[PDB]
Amino acid sequence: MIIPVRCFTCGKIVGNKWEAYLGLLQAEYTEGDALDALGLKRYCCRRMLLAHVDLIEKLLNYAPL
Amino acid sequence: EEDASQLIFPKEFETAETLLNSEVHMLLEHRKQQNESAEDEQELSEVFMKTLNYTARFSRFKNRETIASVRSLLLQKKLHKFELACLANLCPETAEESKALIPSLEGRFEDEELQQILDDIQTKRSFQY
Amino acid sequence: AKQDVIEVIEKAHNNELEPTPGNTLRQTFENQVNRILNDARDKTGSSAQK
């Protein structure tokens, strides 16, 4: 549902990078360019950000109890 | 000591003639009609009601003409009376199915002739829509 | 193989192809084309193994 805390392969933190990843996308930066800025040299971590879906956005639409 | 596959059963049932599930429904309907209106008696037993639903659900024929035609068609052959109702009630799709379900047929029926009999039953059995 | 199949098709188109005594023209044409395609797969496949 939400971005994982760290890469499942090595263990590098990726949750904190999600907030900056989206901010860079709207800043006219390329999809791959944003990953380099965050400091994801390994392709395993770049996977966690390049092709991630934030489903919690649609779940938050529904009102709570 | 009795087995249907080997055509062994009490000698009393030999004189009896088998009946189809759809045909029995007609007999039950005749019994139901008279009891309901002809005479003022107690309601029919639960056993009678249970078998009526079973016959109606598994009734493979609409009217008596279809039932009579199948009965006449199978009577021309050497089919045993036990197989007469069992084959019609089961309605095997193909000859191979009937022999496995009915071991007796394999004794005196070939793979080709029987297939020409089951398909005839298919042309008689009526579907809902 | 593709060119050979066309040549076989052309022969049948012009009635030049002669059916084998043990088969008819329509079936004979299907046999000749099948061998050309079947042989190509085996020949190309064998080269791949090497």
Place this chain on the structure above:
Amino acid sequence: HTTLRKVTANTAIYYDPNPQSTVVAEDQEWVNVYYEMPDFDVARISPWLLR
């Protein structure tokens, strides 16, 4: 096993009033010589044919 169907090309039922008519022109040349011998011609012959 071969039948007449596999060896026959075409068939027709023609009408010839008299035995010598042979309305079919092409076969008139060869039927004449064969028919000279009165084989089965001892009496009337039906004017039908099954060539």
Place this chain on the structure above:
Amino acid sequence: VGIRFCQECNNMLYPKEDKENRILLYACRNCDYQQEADNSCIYVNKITHEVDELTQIIADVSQDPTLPRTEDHPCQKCGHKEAVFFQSHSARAEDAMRLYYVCTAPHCGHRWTE
């Protein structure tokens, strides 16, 4: 091989033979009208049925977009290069493999086989 209808009731004229005049005449049964037959042929039957398909091919297939078009063979009586060709559609001739050409001109409708 053909079929003829009488003028009285327009019914089948079965072949009948008379013993007096010894002439085959097509006579109706229900109506007394009878007419003589000049063909002297009752019917024919081609066992191999090697009937030419040119008469069967319809001239209106020129406008068909699916049928392939080849300019190698022109029409005999037109000279137009374009000509639509296809194989026999008859199941009887399915065993044989042949090509039938039809002129692509709007009104020619000529059919020929090479």
Place this chain on the structure above:
Amino acid sequence: DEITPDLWQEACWIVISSYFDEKGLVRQQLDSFDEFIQMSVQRIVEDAPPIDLQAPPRYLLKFEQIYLSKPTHWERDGAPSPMMPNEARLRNLTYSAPLYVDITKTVIKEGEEQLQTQHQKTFIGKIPIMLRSTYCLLNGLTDRDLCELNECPLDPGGYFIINGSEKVLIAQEKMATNTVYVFAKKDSKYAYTGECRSCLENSSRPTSTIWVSMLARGGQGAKKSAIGQRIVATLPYIKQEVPIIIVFRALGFVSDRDILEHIIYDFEDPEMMEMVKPSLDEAFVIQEQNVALNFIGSRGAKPGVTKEKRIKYAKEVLQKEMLPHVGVSDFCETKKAYFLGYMVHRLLLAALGRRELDDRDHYGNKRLDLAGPLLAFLFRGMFKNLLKEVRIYAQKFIDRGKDFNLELAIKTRIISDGLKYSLATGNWGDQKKAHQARAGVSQVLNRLTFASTLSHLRRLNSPIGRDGKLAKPRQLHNTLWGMVCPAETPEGHAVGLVKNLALMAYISVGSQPSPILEFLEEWSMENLEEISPAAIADATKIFVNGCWVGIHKDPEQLMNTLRKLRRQMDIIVSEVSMIRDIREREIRIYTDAGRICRPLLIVEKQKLLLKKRHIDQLKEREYNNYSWQDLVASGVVEYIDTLEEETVMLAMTPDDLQEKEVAYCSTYTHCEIHPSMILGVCASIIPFPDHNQSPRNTYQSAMGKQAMGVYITNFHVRMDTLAHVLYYPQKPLVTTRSMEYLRFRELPAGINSIVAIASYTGYNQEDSVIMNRSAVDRGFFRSVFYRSYKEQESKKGFDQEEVFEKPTRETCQGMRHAIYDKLDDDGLIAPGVRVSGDDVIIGKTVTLPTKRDCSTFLRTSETGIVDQVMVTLNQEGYKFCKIRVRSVRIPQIGDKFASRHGQKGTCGIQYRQEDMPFTCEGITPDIIINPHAIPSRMTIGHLIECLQGKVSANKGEIGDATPFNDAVNVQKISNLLSDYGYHLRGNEVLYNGFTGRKITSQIFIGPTYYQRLKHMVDDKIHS
């Protein structure tokens, strides 16, 4: 101007985007129901026979109009409160709307005084409403409103909620009606079959089929051999086979020449004439029309005692029972004969071999019945019984002389329960009726995954019975191209019987043929009644829904005008299809529903009608009041059905038709937008399916449905018996363009994995896989499991009733050893309590004539925490509650993991990060698969996908997975990878975790997308 090939790749996908934006993925479900609820329901009521009651007092009851209101819930108070679709699922009640009918009765008591009363909006009953339909509460609502109602905006709908269960009406293929088909069967006593099932418009009477057979030459006899082959036609109500020639005599064509005129159009051809001669011999003795009517009535089902009755019975059978579609009145003898002659004429062509036999599997000969057409047939069953109930109820009232109130006469239960029964159990028709039922339809909607839900809605079923048995529905036919997905098919005995609709393909909703019929009259078209039979020899035949409208002198001009009208959205709708059988001089126009068709770009003079300006408007499709419908209006794109696709040329891509060194075909009529659209919902998500083996693509279709993931967004509010939701459903690195339309990107059902294909420690066989224990500890494939428990306390018996309370050991006599501290004072466990093993989660007791415990324990021994508890009142009004138990399943050695293609592989062993083979950069693969699977039970696409995934991740761009995109190539991907300091083929040097020495073989490692299948070891063992 024109679309350049360098830009066609982006342009082609833009038009497809508009098609799904306007139509959608469930348009075929909604459209058919909309037609059924808008016109078919009205037609059934309007076409109802008059109700007549007699015993002097005459009562005539007629239904004037039908009024339908939006769904509402009727409680004990009876107020018409709105009933939201979500409420239906939670309360386990059918989602439906009330049905109202206007009834007008005229009563005459022999007093020469007629008076009538008006009944406004009589409560006839109710009709289940398909979700997202015109009458649904969620039609035309913005995404914001749907969330407020606890409904997923991405959910396409198109199903019925019955008793809280979502049911989808599986389309059932049926043989097309009002069509002549000639088939050859070697088992029948006759050589050829003139089968032609004829029915009127939507349905006025039950379908009637007549087989105009032709006796085989095998039989030999004194007279049979002479005449040889004769035609025999069997009437629907005549047991014996009567000669076809006698039928025409019964119509009124006493003259024998007229019989040949209708059958033989070309008198010059003698081959066909000889075939009809023997048929005349049998019917020759019957010369008078009355004798022919007498002859037919002799073998009738119920022959009349008197001679005159036989003629009347035959007259009614031929007029009404026979060929209902061509004519139902008493002045259609000429029209009926012409159609009958055509059937014989069609038989003659097939017998002589000049016409090819109709293909059994041809989808043009098969019609698809959706929820609309299916429910339309069902609605007649209850409505017909509804009149009987009114008649029977009034019968006892009428004979007594007193008027009968209508409120009691109309039965609501039959209409309500009648539709609800079959839609729930799945057995069509009436179980009271003594006939065999139809099982397998209205199945439980598969909500395991969003892709599975989409596939189920578009699911198709092959015909059953004689039609399916004779044909080969399992075998894949050529007609499925672009209409039914070839790869997608369930694996097992029922392989190929169940299929899925193609993405772009949709089934015709249906339309009235009246506008088309009127169009022909004003043009050169001439009806049969006006012309003589001799004019049919040269002209072309025109058919409208299988009806003999009449021949046309010039076929080319009319079709060109007809084509223009279709492209211009004139009186002829784009849905309508016109078929031009050039080889047979037959023009067939079909307007009935159930016709599967797909859009196709129109090509004129080897030039696409779709220009750059059209794409430019589509690029700005939003805020410009431009949609897909505009494209059809401009005539750039139209719809082609299976029959019209028969005589329509297609081009794969514009590059094929623009120019070629050797012209394969210089006359292209239509061009496919993109070939990949042939794939279905489950097949579309597969990259490089062409690179993949056909069985593997079919295998994935089954695995894809079984994959666990986020099925919808509003999962928390709803309660489902089985629902698996993934912790981190991540969109794939390699995605197909069609994936966007499926919305699988928004709701994926898998997690990518850096898969190194190697044989590590020999713990993975052909069917196995090795995981990374450290990765799972970080949430590699973990998912939640939801099981909903339902229970209601109902007063079934006056003496004994169910109640909800704590089953105390003292007050309760019979009980099972378990912990009862979990239950609260109300007998329901509150949310947030951990439950493990055998534990009571809901308290229920029966006051038997002291109470006996009948509570419900956990189905399995799994340890879970209750998520939410719901208390409601069922339809009967009794207290009813639902509770969802939530458990967390950690992937282990017994779980089955499957790639996007290939056979599922169980996790042979889990290894820690240290034990896994690390590369030079320190990247331990998340999953290791057996290399020996790749050869046979796997595809090279896995290696290509790994290569694409490595490039996609390294370059930070989502790869394109178009099956037939020439831009993407293995060599091109390899070159891109080499630019990022990686092997062009993706091979890497992996250092063994146990021993640090380099492995001699360089392993191939890449981020391959993977999905977790529902099959888990915990479920099996816990059972």
Place this chain on the structure above:
Amino acid sequence: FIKDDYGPESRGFVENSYLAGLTPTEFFFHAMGGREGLIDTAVKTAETGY
């Protein structure tokens, strides 16, 4: 494909390897061949087990 076409591509000859990628026409023809195998495999197990 044009009417009455007996060429390699028209009749289902697949000249492209899995690695190279099959043409749209070949993909459907490949599916038809694979479908027959699945049907045969499904019935083969049922008959052989009997």
